[PDB]
Design a protein around this ligand. Sequence first.
Ligand SMILES: [Mg+2]
Ligand SMILES: [Mg+2]
Ligand SMILES: [Mg+2]
Ligand SMILES: [Mg+2]
Ligand SMILES: [Mg+2]
Ligand SMILES: [Mg+2]
Ligand SMILES: [Mg+2]
Ligand SMILES: [Mg+2]
Ligand SMILES: [Mg+2]
Lengths: 240, 58
Amino acid sequence: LTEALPKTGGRNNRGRITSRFIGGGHKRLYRIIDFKRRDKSGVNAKVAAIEYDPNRSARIALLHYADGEKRYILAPEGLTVGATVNAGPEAEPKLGNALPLRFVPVGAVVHALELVPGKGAQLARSAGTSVQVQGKESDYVIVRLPSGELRRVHSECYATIGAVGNAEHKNIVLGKAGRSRWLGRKPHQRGSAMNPVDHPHGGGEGRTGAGRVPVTPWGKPTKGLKTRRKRKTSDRFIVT
Amino acid sequence: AKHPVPKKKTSKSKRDMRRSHHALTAPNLTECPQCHGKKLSHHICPNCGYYDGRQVLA
RNA sequence: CGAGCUGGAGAUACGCUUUGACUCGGGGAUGUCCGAAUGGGGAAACCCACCUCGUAAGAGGUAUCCGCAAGGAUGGGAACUCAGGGAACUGAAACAUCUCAGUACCUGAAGGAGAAGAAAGAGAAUUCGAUUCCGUUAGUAGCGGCGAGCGAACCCGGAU
RNA sequence: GAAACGAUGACUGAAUCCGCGCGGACCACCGCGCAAGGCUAAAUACUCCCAGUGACCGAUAGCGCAUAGUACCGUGAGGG
RNA sequence: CCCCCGUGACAGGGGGCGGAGGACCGAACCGGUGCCUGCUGAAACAGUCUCGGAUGAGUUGUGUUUAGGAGUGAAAAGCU
RNA sequence: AACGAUAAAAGAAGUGAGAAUCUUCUUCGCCGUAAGGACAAGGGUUCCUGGGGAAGGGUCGUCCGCCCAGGGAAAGUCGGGACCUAAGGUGAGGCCGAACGGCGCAGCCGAUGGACAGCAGGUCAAGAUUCCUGCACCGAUCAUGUGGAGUGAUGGAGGGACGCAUUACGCUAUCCAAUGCCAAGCUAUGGCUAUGCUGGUUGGUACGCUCAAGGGCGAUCGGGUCAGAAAAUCUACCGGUCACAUGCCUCAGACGUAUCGGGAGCUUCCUCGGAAGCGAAGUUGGAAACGCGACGGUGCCAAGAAAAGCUUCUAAACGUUGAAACAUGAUUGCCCGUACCGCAAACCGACACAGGUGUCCGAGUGUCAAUGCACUAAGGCGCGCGAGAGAACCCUCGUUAAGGAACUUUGCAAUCUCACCCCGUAACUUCGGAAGAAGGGGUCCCCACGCUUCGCGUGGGGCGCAGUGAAUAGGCCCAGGCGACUGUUUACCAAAAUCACAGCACUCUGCCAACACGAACAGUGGACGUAUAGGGUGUGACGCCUGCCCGGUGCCGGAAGGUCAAGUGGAGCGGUGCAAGCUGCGAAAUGAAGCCCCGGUGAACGGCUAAGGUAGCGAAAUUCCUUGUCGGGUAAGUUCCGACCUGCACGAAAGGCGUAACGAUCUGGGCGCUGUCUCAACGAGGGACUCGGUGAAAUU
Ligand SMILES: [Mg+2]
Ligand SMILES: [Mg+2]
Ligand SMILES: [Mg+2]
Ligand SMILES: [Mg+2]
Ligand SMILES: [Mg+2]
Ligand SMILES: [Mg+2]
Ligand SMILES: [Mg+2]
Ligand SMILES: [Mg+2]
Ligand SMILES: [Mg+2]
């Protein structure tokens, strides 16, 4: 427990509620976690400890740089306490090392990957995830994202060797209700158990099931949502 | 509501046929044997306090 | 201005008035705190500062916007004026055009008035000749699910 | 609507006297006027305030108020 | 966590000790299930008896935020 | 009719024009985790004193929370402000916007939280950590001495910084006992005679090689450039050195001495009852916090504010003759709140309303325990109409012959049960549970004996009808529907089979994500997250499962060709003029998405012509005919259980079938008990009736 900014609940913006549900809590805090990890490249550090922190589902490594400063950094599946972390293109592609893709061996399974030089990590970071490399092209690398997708990425971007783990939300069965309350307000409210007024799947004497749409009028099963833009060219194989 | 309720205002008359029975009976005062003021039979004379002798204080 | 005055108050006491009170006119001087409010905070009238002038008491400045600078602006006005935005009931015996209306309401700006104004005009006489207002033309020309219904201008008279 | 002209958000984009606009699509002819700078009394409107008047009222009338937006009601706007 | 017994795939069972739980009984507290009462009420929704919950998705104070076709809603078209 | 809870009241005495209703005394009764006490908020003067006697006070009133007048409230340290920051509010300069205006970093405002200097008493009619008395502490400013030198920021670091449950040890507040101590007297009814009875039985401060559990702890040297923007004699990291034990540092509290106060009562005057002066003892034993020691120990996951004060550290800086710091004096101390009510006739409820209100204190005895239950201290109060009567009927209670659910829509209601020991306890089961299952026994008093003590066991004895002897205080069981479960809901007729839920499934979403709020290429929420994530929809523990039909609609993908907008493209047609020219109309082809079209997809709409019901269940909460038919239980069953099947109109995630456990759920049965009932009776209290006081309503 140490050196972290305070987090405050809030499930809606300026005026009213925006992202339904979510209201419970516990008071959790925020721990600034190094993602971009460049200003520190060129300095070795050791796993002082792996603390378990919320707002993440992902162990947290408390690294210490020769500089003297500490910096929490996601903990990949494997690092024990006391090992070594080193940033900068000059780094043995091992667990915890952060080295851009250009310098990353094909078939190498890494996470914490960015999408644009800096602004921190972005892909592969949530509890146990693995984005492996496919095979450099020109300036961009082909990689496989946890959703089974293929995106070019200019190898200019660092990455962390290895895959996160923090065990696995597989046996975590949240027991009975109220565990969800240890986190977010009573989940989903069956709009089919509301009123013609309140939502599309309202009324009906008895029990319904027609039209299939979201709280508003769109459709939820198999209706595309992404639009026509840039990244679009920079992408390969959305479906599946 | 106020369930039973009257069907019509009652005559000033009717209303009086009624009260033909509310007339007080004046006491039947007796005259105290001593101070001679009037008294209430079987009670003590409030003016002298007697009832043969003087029971109540002056 | 000349016997009275001492507010409404209807009371007592003290008093003040020709070196003319009082009252009426007309200028000054005082004018705590809040309020655009503007030293800073503030759930109005409270709470806290600072710099300068200084006997200390006490005085004064300390807001933002235009401008060297004087100096101007922020606020408030019953209705009237123009502007930006602009309903519906209702009618059409229903209703979507259309009507009710660009009315009601909101907002901005302004003054005692505004707005408008000195013609790339109106008109059919090779006429009038800034703008505005009243009369008339006329409910005519025309607009209109050519339905409900809406409705000019020129000329001519008059304010100026 | 055959529907001109005025206006403007969006694209465009002219001339200048043997020049320019319009006169209800459009053309010629005929005709009236010169746009893209400006300021301007006066007659016009209203009425918080003031005076005068009234085939206006005269106290359940007349303003809500012979005075009070008070008492009273409302968290409040507000009503009164 | 510490001791004793057991074995054919089977386990576990036992004693200490620990102190878990949208665990149990139950008062404050939160609720309001059934009956009577009360309906010109003590009360514009209550009382008595009875009952539900009782470390939990718990109960509550202060400050603060969301509103009208709008907010809020463990969802009755409920509350505002 | 009512006079606002059935916590009662009696007498005496006093005042007065007049008193059930005011005051005094003496009794009675009610509350006592409160109907006592202290605040908060809210209200304001309601507080105190003297008057008053219209109206208000459900009745009187000589009285009052009402009317009149006067008085009362006192803080360097208690709360707040001149200090801090959270949500949130605001916001120069910035981002947006038809207007008004909408957002927004720093900064600022903003407690309900942080920080911070006092205690013990006395006492006005009415105030008190505010006034007095005693002793104390904090800051500030000056003087004096000491000192002998730096002082050290709107900056760095350290720190303030923080959860839930459970738990060891020491202690206190506080409470209990005694042939302890002090004080006062008296005692009689039969006795006691004091080893009886009543009452009191220490708070602050200062010192003490005194006792004392518990609690806290690295310092130092150096290294490195890459860290704290920078700087550092600070902080972090690296390593060296001693960091067993320990050791220190600190002491909750106790004890002793001193001293200051208080202390049951005593005495005196008295204008009637206060005033004044004085004063004893302070023991041993026992219990004990939700507090103190302390930011203690262990365990747990859902993983538990910020900011200033503070500590150290430099920058800059004036200064190293006169510094910072300590001490001893002195002077100094601002604004606001502090009365009274405050779980209630003083606040919210139109009423002095049976309601609503946050926090704290909350004694004793008995009872495993307790903030339960009974009685009761302190203290507070008998509820602002009263008296009689003793009928009908109504409400709230007590008992009830014989019977025992015959009542009735339903055992609705009301009984029975009812605590704590011991013994004993089924099906079924996810092996937890079903269980407090079911059933049976004990329970008081004395004495001896032994025990771990309060307490308890063993034996003997005793008394009653009866011994959790009075109050608190489960009725039990079989079977079925529904829902798994705890939970949630129609404030004021529905609590449930509703909703939610853990679990499952489909699908969308590549991150300025899908999605949503918004005037807005602003801002923001999703998320300071990133696909084992977030959104949406449906299903709803667990278990075995979950079929057939993509014709139609939708969704995805395919995609030749057909069709389709503006626009591009200018022929063809017409106008005017003399003419050049200027002007109307208007194709071919070409031209986006989409629509037609091809295939696909059911835990998509949906159906069982595109197919026709795999399993499982079945007259079921989904069956019409219907009280179907047989069986069950009953003397007798339209209901209920089990089968069958002819499923009017079951059926597999609008989920099918089952399932331990759970239910103020719904249904049927049984045991026990009972006034539910055959039939009601008697009794009680509170109305109803009567008299005195006050005195409505709907209706007409
Ligand atoms: Mg008259
Ligand atoms: Mg007036
Ligand atoms: Mg109970
Ligand atoms: Mg229960
Ligand atoms: Mg009586
Ligand atoms: Mg069944
Ligand atoms: Mg249920
Ligand atoms: Mg429940
Ligand atoms: Mg009477």
